[PDB]
Design a protein around this ligand. Structure first.
Ligand SMILES: *[C@@H]1O[C@H](CO)[C@@H](O[C@@H]2O[C@H](CO)[C@@H](O[C@@H]3O[C@H](CO)[C@@H](O)[C@H](O[C@H]4O[C@H](CO)[C@@H](O)[C@H](O)[C@@H]4O)[C@@H]3O)[C@H](O)[C@H]2NC(C)=O)[C@H](O)[C@H]1NC(C)=O
Ligand SMILES: *[C@@H]1O[C@H](CO)[C@@H](O[C@@H]2O[C@H](CO)[C@@H](O[C@@H]3O[C@H](CO)[C@@H](O)[C@H](O[C@H]4O[C@H](CO)[C@@H](O)[C@H](O)[C@@H]4O)[C@@H]3O)[C@H](O)[C@H]2NC(C)=O)[C@H](O)[C@H]1NC(C)=O
Ligand SMILES: *[C@@H]1O[C@H](CO)[C@@H](O[C@@H]2O[C@H](CO)[C@@H](O)[C@H](O)[C@H]2NC(C)=O)[C@H](O)[C@H]1NC(C)=O
Ligand SMILES: *[C@@H]1O[C@H](CO)[C@@H](O[C@@H]2O[C@H](CO)[C@@H](O)[C@H](O)[C@H]2NC(C)=O)[C@H](O)[C@H]1NC(C)=O
Ligand SMILES: *[C@@H]1O[C@H](CO)[C@@H](O[C@@H]2O[C@H](CO)[C@@H](O)[C@H](O)[C@H]2NC(C)=O)[C@H](O)[C@H]1NC(C)=O
Ligand SMILES: *[C@@H]1O[C@H](CO)[C@@H](O[C@@H]2O[C@H](CO)[C@@H](O)[C@H](O)[C@H]2NC(C)=O)[C@H](O)[C@H]1NC(C)=O
Ligand SMILES: *[C@@H]1O[C@H](CO)[C@@H](O[C@@H]2O[C@H](CO)[C@@H](O)[C@H](O)[C@H]2NC(C)=O)[C@H](O)[C@H]1NC(C)=O
Ligand SMILES: *[C@@H]1O[C@H](CO)[C@@H](O[C@@H]2O[C@H](CO)[C@@H](O)[C@H](O)[C@H]2NC(C)=O)[C@H](O)[C@H]1NC(C)=O
Ligand SMILES: *[C@@H]1O[C@H](CO)[C@@H](O[C@@H]2O[C@H](CO)[C@@H](O)[C@H](O)[C@H]2NC(C)=O)[C@H](O)[C@H]1NC(C)=O
Ligand SMILES: *[C@@H]1O[C@H](CO)[C@@H](O)[C@H](O)[C@H]1NC(C)=O
Ligand SMILES: *[C@@H]1O[C@H](CO)[C@@H](O)[C@H](O)[C@H]1NC(C)=O
Ligand SMILES: *[C@@H]1O[C@H](CO)[C@@H](O)[C@H](O)[C@H]1NC(C)=O
Ligand SMILES: *[C@@H]1O[C@H](CO)[C@@H](O)[C@H](O)[C@H]1NC(C)=O
Ligand SMILES: *[C@@H]1O[C@H](CO)[C@@H](O)[C@H](O)[C@H]1NC(C)=O
Ligand SMILES: *[C@@H]1O[C@H](CO)[C@@H](O)[C@H](O)[C@H]1NC(C)=O
Ligand SMILES: *[C@@H]1O[C@H](CO)[C@@H](O)[C@H](O)[C@H]1NC(C)=O
Ligand SMILES: *[C@@H]1O[C@H](CO)[C@@H](O)[C@H](O)[C@H]1NC(C)=O
Ligand SMILES: *[C@@H]1O[C@H](CO)[C@@H](O)[C@H](O)[C@H]1NC(C)=O
Ligand SMILES: *[C@@H]1O[C@H](CO)[C@@H](O)[C@H](O)[C@H]1NC(C)=O
Ligand SMILES: *[C@@H]1O[C@H](CO)[C@@H](O)[C@H](O)[C@H]1NC(C)=O
Ligand SMILES: *[C@@H]1O[C@H](CO)[C@@H](O)[C@H](O)[C@H]1NC(C)=O
Ligand SMILES: *[C@@H]1O[C@H](CO)[C@@H](O)[C@H](O)[C@H]1NC(C)=O
Ligand SMILES: *[C@@H]1O[C@H](CO)[C@@H](O)[C@H](O)[C@H]1NC(C)=O
Ligand SMILES: *[C@@H]1O[C@H](CO)[C@@H](O)[C@H](O)[C@H]1NC(C)=O
Ligand SMILES: *[C@@H]1O[C@H](CO)[C@@H](O)[C@H](O)[C@H]1NC(C)=O
Ligand SMILES: *[C@@H]1O[C@H](CO)[C@@H](O)[C@H](O)[C@H]1NC(C)=O
Ligand SMILES: *[C@@H]1O[C@H](CO)[C@@H](O)[C@H](O)[C@H]1NC(C)=O
Ligand SMILES: *[C@@H]1O[C@H](CO)[C@@H](O)[C@H](O)[C@H]1NC(C)=O
Ligand SMILES: *[C@@H]1O[C@H](CO)[C@@H](O)[C@H](O)[C@H]1NC(C)=O
Ligand SMILES: *[C@@H]1O[C@H](CO)[C@@H](O)[C@H](O)[C@H]1NC(C)=O
Ligand SMILES: *[C@@H]1O[C@H](CO)[C@@H](O)[C@H](O)[C@H]1NC(C)=O
Ligand SMILES: *[C@@H]1O[C@H](CO)[C@@H](O)[C@H](O)[C@H]1NC(C)=O
Ligand SMILES: *[C@@H]1O[C@H](CO)[C@@H](O)[C@H](O)[C@H]1NC(C)=O
Lengths: 436, 112, 122, 122, 436, 122
């Protein structure tokens, strides 16, 4: 009566270690990944439904951990800049500088160490206002992190380009994927297929806007753990890109300073041509249409005649109040208020966002490990696809939404929401009419 | 460590016509075989080397072939040219990797 | 397809059992992780094979045993189980008897082997 | 000798098959390297054993199957193959049919096991 | 009809990881190896031939990588000498010094750090000319690597003796070996046997001459990737050793200087007795016979009446123009022109080679990691077996050859040329008359 | 109990053989140590299974062979060995013949498989 069957096609929810694969000096060491399958297979499961939950998906946690650990390993061999924690004697840059950019750059000089222990050298360099603090309340200044953390120079040969990786299941596991074009992140998913590896995902880091991800295939999607709870984020995925063009219109020079045997510091040298403010342009008509689509869908949760208003972010550190990104190797902090300034009532041009630049970066919102971004010579221009927003509710007929930042995890759960990891359990039994 | 077996030990003929001598190696010697003709009273003379090449001290009358571990010698016409004992010699010892270790089989007496 | 039979009924699915069987074996970040994963995959494989060995089903995808169905585990008819149900549904229906059945299978095999020795000694 | 049969003909070599079988299992520099090598050696062993399981040849050095020789794979005579050829030469002669034969062996075993269950259910 | 056979004696070319074994504070950590088999077996393969290629042998690559990595691990716990990058005030040593050695040693003094952060000490030591550069074009000098690399003192307790190791295959693999006494590195090899482990190989490092390897059993062997291509090296293996006797006839003292808590630097102290030039002696008659044998074999590739000439090396750094070696713990750079000075026409005494000594060593031709060799007290004498040469063609009836250096890989492929790694593939099928 | 049969006689102990069989598979300090231990445990398991395969006892806890007892190994009576002695005592009594018996078992199995092929070829 009891018949034992091996190879039974059943599974259970499971948490395991995933490995990366890559389709082939990068900060994320993507060369360390397993080469991908040039033609991966996908199997449709007929008559199979499954329950998914993107808010409890541990694939997000592994991606978060791998990214931070790789980032830290990439700085391990790079030169430390601790000899720079000196008193800087410093004044402003006033040569051909545009107003409202005036006061942003400073010309500082100091006594730096050199190749021999017995010698000192006088050097000078330019710094951005956001990287220094005044101590002598020319005036004495110090680098902003000298009383809290060590500063490590990023290696100039290492790229920050967000080259995508694929996550792949180990033997004994499978990754289930949703195909439902309207899936909102939780509950039954009527159309499921299996893959061994995920689509390539770019480890892009941003705050208020998501700059280079996937677009919704059909309708604009609004996803949240609750919607109702004002303590939760709302992730909005666009079904069309919004093009954004960013620039740093200052032709800079770069020079190296030897600070000890085998070690050098890269300093901003001087500026060729006039000094101008960094900025980003967003097409105006596209932005307007894009919000109109978002509002029509937000209203489904708030009421047919509910008014929706957008407002800018709350006060706080640039890292949480501005739109930040790494592009061309520079770290931009842009003012987004020009994008969130409207009230939506029931029934060519551009928006220019001014930006600030910082060289001393606390990359993962951790304290004690500061990275110094060496300057880049020449002029930087970037073009990217805005694919979505992170919004919060500002919380009786009007709702107000504000952009905001969030955990790094929220920028990855937006791509991994369709995937689930299960383990295969091949043994099972059933009654039959046979006996040995 | 290469052992050569030679057969028949005694071969004879009427005057006129051919006879053959066979030789079997215990292991392939990759054609490293030499044939010698020893008449009573002297050292052996080399007739054929590397299985089938003549030394030119011998006419086309003496022909042979083979490969691997198995070889033969044919004497095309016997005019009482000799009453020699013919010997099969291995010139390569595959167990050592050299040409410094030789082996001989017993010989064959040819009578005519 | 590896899980292609997931939507098939039990009597239809258990014909493609080798498809899943063939896919069970298949110091830096992404370095040490692979070594650890490989070891655990091997351990899982071996535990399942050891059980088939213990129950007398080694080398088979389908094996009959001599253990009776006790009815209370599932009082469904064979024509209902094999034709109108999938393996996922079945696994849920009798999930809580897994340990009962395995214990019964193990004892039966020990008794069988002892009896075979008594006959070979005759 | 582990590869001592390499120069033997196929019909002579396949009598010493256990000689090779017995030798398949046998954070610093020369530290981590051994751990990685051991794991991979285990995986190789298991993949070969799984195939013998799937084809119904588990536990045997020599097993007959019920799959016909299709001739086009090799149209040599049995007296030529077994007596005048070595396994290295043979492996080269039919190397490109390896995947054909394995697929045929797998399907045959699945059909056999299903039929045995139908008889035990009778 | 189809019969499946398991344990079939066949194999394929393969690349895997080999592990070391050793027959039992050493720089190569040979104690970390697997103990060897006191009586290893070798199996002759009757009727089996195989194709070998020493120029594409990946065993060479693993040996190269293991050696470098072990070398670096051995310096990990050793004291850094960065406090020595100071201005040295320095003069010449003129006390009882032999002419043509005069100017080689210098007496330098400097302000060194000490146990307490508040104190400095005046110390002096002797340096070889090759380890310093003048900066003030007594005169100011600096150590030669202070503008390019960090200097690490080798631990004085660590031995550089080239204790041999054996490479062993993992389960599932076998190492095939050639027995053919005339094998020239490529093509069919008529006599093959199997081993699990290689013979012991000494990790000896040298340039122009190979000082302690294997000898050819019968004839002198000339091996090259091409011979014809003037861009390729020719490796010449002798069938008899040439004895060479090297000495450093200066009785030196050694003193330690404390440079900080738990740290000390080893300095050359002073010289007891007269100061003399380091040198090596090569037996003259043996060298002459040895070249005559090499020439007879070289002519086989160049023509019956072709004239062969030997000439010394081209200009460049000592590391590539001289014969270098590590013996007794000292690093010698010897002038070999006395050995390559002849023309060979168709149809007791000694050669003395003067030598130079360096303490700052860029061991693997890498830049950024410099090792400092602490001095050795007393007098050093070494005797070794020259086993072969690395020659290049200086490229119409005369050929000229020059000694030269090469990759470290060329000193190891000269021992590993006889070995190949293959993997065993135990499954196979064949037609039989049986059916289940 | 895992070693509960240690004090039992041989004829009593060899009824609970699955108890021990089921317990054979079961970069920081206490990190790397577990990974190394897991790999070695797997290797030990596989070496024992390979021997049962080679001797023709795969899948069994108890298997009869066709190798005779040579008497000189132990000249005790069956009623003495099975009823008045434990496995620990027995293991000591014949510990030095272990390699003899294993060699005999291996050759016997090779002869048996070759003969079975000759019959299936008939
Ligand atoms: C969103 O996606 C877009 C599109 O993929 C991406 O824009 C790309 O950014 C990279 C880096 O800023 C650009 O690549 C550079 O192009 C210039 C053109 O002359 C080259 O000179 C650069 O090479 C130098 O810098 C490299 C830095 O590692 C060095 O390695 C190299 O040796 C040179 O020094 C470099 O190729 C790329 O062109 C754009 N793509 C387009 C279409 O413009 C954008 O950055 C993404 N957004 C975000 C926020 O990540
Ligand atoms: C080619 O091979 C030869 C022969 O093997 C090899 O010569 C050997 O070199 C070593 C090291 O130079 C010699 O060993 C030394 O002998 C002296 C004799 O009194 C000892 O005092 C030494 O011991 C001291 O130094 C050790 C260094 O680690 C310390 O550990 C120890 O505590 C002592 O301080 C040491 O034993 C050896 O004697 C010679 N062999 C002969 C026969 O002379 C040669 O170097 C090789 N060539 C190359 C280039 O490698
Ligand atoms: C390191 O120095 C900075 C700069 O003085 C300190 O940050 C300031 O802390 C005061 C505390 O009330 C704030 O009002 C200032 O606005 C802060 N300055 C900036 C630039 O944010 C910082 O707290 C010091 N760190 C420690 C550990 O004392
Ligand atoms: C971001 O940009 C907006 C406008 O470009 C800045 O808004 C101004 O803020 C001052 C603060 O009191 C107001 O008085 C002005 O009326 C605001 N202008 C507008 C058009 O609203 C805003 O301050 C910028 N944010 C930051 C952090 O600099
Ligand atoms: C999904 O379910 C449908 C029916 O619910 C299955 O359809 C059967 O397909 C077989 C194919 O020959 C037909 O013979 C049956 O008659 C079909 N069922 C009915 C009710 O007509 C379909 O095969 C299922 N998918 C899977 C993977 O089994
Ligand atoms: C290598 O090849 C030779 C022949 O080519 C094999 O020699 C055979 O050895 C057996 C041993 O009893 C003899 O019965 C055969 O008659 C021999 N062959 C001939 C043509 O006489 C030798 O055994 C082969 N080596 C291996 C390992 O098989
Ligand atoms: C470090 O200092 C050395 C010594 O001055 C530099 O090497 C010299 O470079 C010049 C360049 O033309 C050569 O002519 C000299 O012959 C070199 N000297 C020696 C001793 O080789 C070296 O280049 C400096 N390193 C760096 C990175 O600048
Ligand atoms: C190596 O030694 C040889 C001779 O022992 C040196 O050769 C001398 O070089 C100078 C350079 O112009 C010549 O004028 C002499 O005539 C050469 N002498 C001989 C006998 O040829 C050679 O320079 C030394 N090499 C180095 C790098 O010092
Ligand atoms: C330990 O030894 C005692 C006797 O020496 C064993 O006792 C036997 O227990 C069985 C249980 O049914 C009885 O039938 C036997 O008659 C007992 N022996 C005697 C001499 O009466 C006891 O079982 C042993 N323990 C173990 C684990 O075997
Ligand atoms: C530098 O910036 C400070 C900021 O308030 C300003 O007061 C000062 O006048 C500036 N100096 C120059 C030279 O512009
Ligand atoms: C900084 O001061 C130095 C002093 O001479 C001057 O040469 C340099 O141009 C200044 N840099 C800027 C950007 O004002
Ligand atoms: C360097 O040190 C000297 C010492 O008196 C000081 O006067 C000078 O201002 C320092 N220079 C800088 C740029 O800090
Ligand atoms: C997502 O859709 C399901 C469909 O029933 C719904 O129950 C769930 O509440 C939706 N998610 C949110 C955040 O509303
Ligand atoms: C958040 O979701 C839970 C789900 O049951 C719900 O009970 C809770 O009320 C939600 N939060 C708010 C503020 O509604
Ligand atoms: C943004 O628009 C302004 C409008 O005049 C233009 O001058 C500027 O160059 C644009 N910026 C970019 C990045 O194109
Ligand atoms: C970005 O640059 C492209 C260049 O062709 C331009 O067409 C596009 O309109 C620009 N986007 C914005 C927002 O100005
Ligand atoms: C979009 O354009 C229409 C045109 O009249 C305008 O009324 C509306 O306010 C615009 N919306 C935004 C967000 O700019
Ligand atoms: C948002 O806009 C208001 C307008 O008055 C401004 O005061 C506030 O500081 C802005 N928020 C940020 C983060 O700039
Ligand atoms: C928001 O809209 C008001 C409408 O008059 C405008 O004055 C204000 O400048 C706008 N804010 C931004 C940041 O553009
Ligand atoms: C910056 O100025 C230099 C001066 O020659 C010029 O060569 C370079 O192209 C300029 N860079 C840009 C982006 O204009
Ligand atoms: C933006 O989206 C368009 C859609 O087709 C795509 O072609 C383009 O490459 C995207 N740009 C980026 C930066 O991904
Ligand atoms: C030291 O060496 C230099 C090298 O040219 C020489 O000129 C100088 O005279 C030497 N000094 C002594 C004291 O010998
Ligand atoms: C170096 O100079 C010191 C100064 O007194 C002297 O004592 C020492 O002997 C000198 N060393 C040599 C080798 O000349
Ligand atoms: C040590 O420092 C003092 C400071 O004046 C200097 O005079 C002396 O020459 C230095 N000594 C050496 C050996 O460098
Ligand atoms: C080595 O010997 C083989 C034998 O045929 C020959 O073909 C090959 O060219 C030789 N190697 C060189 C470098 O000549
Ligand atoms: C190097 O060897 C290759 C082998 O085919 C040959 O073609 C080439 O011509 C050789 N180089 C020279 C310069 O002969
Ligand atoms: C080399 O030969 C010379 C000849 O006089 C001798 O004095 C010297 O000591 C020898 N060197 C060695 C290392 O034996
Ligand atoms: C090396 O020293 C030994 C010591 O007996 C001597 O016999 C030999 O000739 C010396 N070699 C040379 C090249 O002088
Ligand atoms: C070897 O010795 C002979 C003796 O006459 C001499 O002619 C020949 O040139 C010598 N060769 C070398 C390389 O010294
Ligand atoms: C080789 O000998 C010649 C002889 O004049 C010499 O000039 C050249 O520098 C020597 N080569 C080396 C590296 O010493
Ligand atoms: C090379 O031979 C010539 C021949 O006269 C000789 O003068 C010269 O010194 C020799 N070179 C060396 C380095 O011994
Ligand atoms: C060096 O000199 C010291 C002085 O006593 C002596 O003891 C030692 O043996 C000498 N070393 C040598 C190699 O002669
Ligand atoms: C040199 O070769 C001879 C040859 O028998 C050997 O005995 C001696 O030990 C060898 N010397 C070295 C240093 O290997």
């Amino acid at each position: 009566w009891v018949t034992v069957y091996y190879g039974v096609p059943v599974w259970k929810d499971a948490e395991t270690t995933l490995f990366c694969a890559s389709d082939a000096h990068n900060v994320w060491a993507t060369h360390a990944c397993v080469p991908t399958d040039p033609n991966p297979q996908e199997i449709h499961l007929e008559n199979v439904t499954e329950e998914f939950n993107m808010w409890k998906n541990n694939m997000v946690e592994q991606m978060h951990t791998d990214i931070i650990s790789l980032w830290d390993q990439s700085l391990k061999p790079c030169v430390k800049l601790t000899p720079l924690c000196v008193t800087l004697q410093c004044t402003n840059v006033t040569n051909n500088i545009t107003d409202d950019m005036r006061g942003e750059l400073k010309n500082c000089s100091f006594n730096m160490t050199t190749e021999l222990r017995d010698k000192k050298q006088k050097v000078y360099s330019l710094f951005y206002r956001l990287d220094v603090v005044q101590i002598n309340e020319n005036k004495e200044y110090r680098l902003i992190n000298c009383n809290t953390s060590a500063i490590t120079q990023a290696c100039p040969k290492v790229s920050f380009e967000p080259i995508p990786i694929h996550y792949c299941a180990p033997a004994g596991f499978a990754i289930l994927k949703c195909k439902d074009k309207k899936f909102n992140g939780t509950g039954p998913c009527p159309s499921v297929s299996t893959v061994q590896c995920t689509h390539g995902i770019k480890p892009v880091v941003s705050t208020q806007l998501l700059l280079n991800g996937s677009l919704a295939e059909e309708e604009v999607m609004i996803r949240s753990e609750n919607i109702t709870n004002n303590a939760k984020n709302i992730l909005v995925q666009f079904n069309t890109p919004v093009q954004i063009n960013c620039t740093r219109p200052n032709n800079n020079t770069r020079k190296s300073i030897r600070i000890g045997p085998g070690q050098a510091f890269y300093a901003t040298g001087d500026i060729i041509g006039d000094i101008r403010q960094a900025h980003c342009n967003v097409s105006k008509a596209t932005w307007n249409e894009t919000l109109g689509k978002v509002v029509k869908q937000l209203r489904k949760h708030f009421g047919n005649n509910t008014i929706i208003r957008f407002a800018n972010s709350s006060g706080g550190d640039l890292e949480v109040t501005t739109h930040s990104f790494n592009c061309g190797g520079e770290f931009f902090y842009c003012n987004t208020s020009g994008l969130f300034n409207s009230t939506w009532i029931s029934n060519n041009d551009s928006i220019t966002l001014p930006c600030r630049i910082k060289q001393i970066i606390n990359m993962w919102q951790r304290i004690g490990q500061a990275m110094y971004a060496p300057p880049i010579q020449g002029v930087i221009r970037c073009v990217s696809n805005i694919t979505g927003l992170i919004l919060t509710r500002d919380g009786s007929t009007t709702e107000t939404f504000r952009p905001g930042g969030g955990d790094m995890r929220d920028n990855w759960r937006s791509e991994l929401y369709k995937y689930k990891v299960v383990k295969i359990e091949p043994l099972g039994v059933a009654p039959t009419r046979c006996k040995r | 460590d290469i052992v050569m077996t030679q057969t028949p030990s005694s071969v004879s003929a009427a005057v006129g016509g051919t006879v053959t001598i066979n030789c079997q190696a215990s292991e392939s010697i990759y054609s490293g075989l030499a044939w010698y003709q020893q008449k009573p009273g002297q050292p052996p003379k080399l007739l054929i080397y590397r299985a089938s090449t003549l030394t030119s001290g011998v006419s086309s009358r003496f022909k042979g072939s083979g490969s691997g571990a198995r070889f033969t010698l044919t004497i095309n016409d016997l005019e009482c040219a000799d009453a020699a004992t013919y010997y099969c010699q291995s010139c390569y010892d595959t167990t050592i990797g050299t040409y410094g270790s030789w082996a001989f089989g017993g010989g064959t007496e040819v009578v005519v | 397809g590896f899980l292609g039979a997931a939507g098939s009924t039990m009597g239809a699915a258990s014909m493609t059992l080798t498809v899943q069987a063939r896919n069970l074996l298949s110091l830096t970040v992404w370095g040490i992780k692979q070594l650890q994963a490989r070891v655990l995959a091997v351990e899982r494989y071996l535990r399942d094979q050891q059980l088939l060995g213990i129950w007398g089903c080694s080398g088979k995808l389908i094996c009959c045993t001599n253990v009776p169905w006790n009815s209370s585990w599932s009082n469904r008819n064979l024509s209902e189980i094999w034709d109108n149900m999938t393996w996922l549904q079945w696994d849920k229906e009798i999930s809580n008897y897994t340990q009962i059945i395995y214990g019964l299978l193990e004892e039966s095999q020990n008794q069988q082997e002892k009896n075979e020795q008594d006959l070979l000694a005759l």
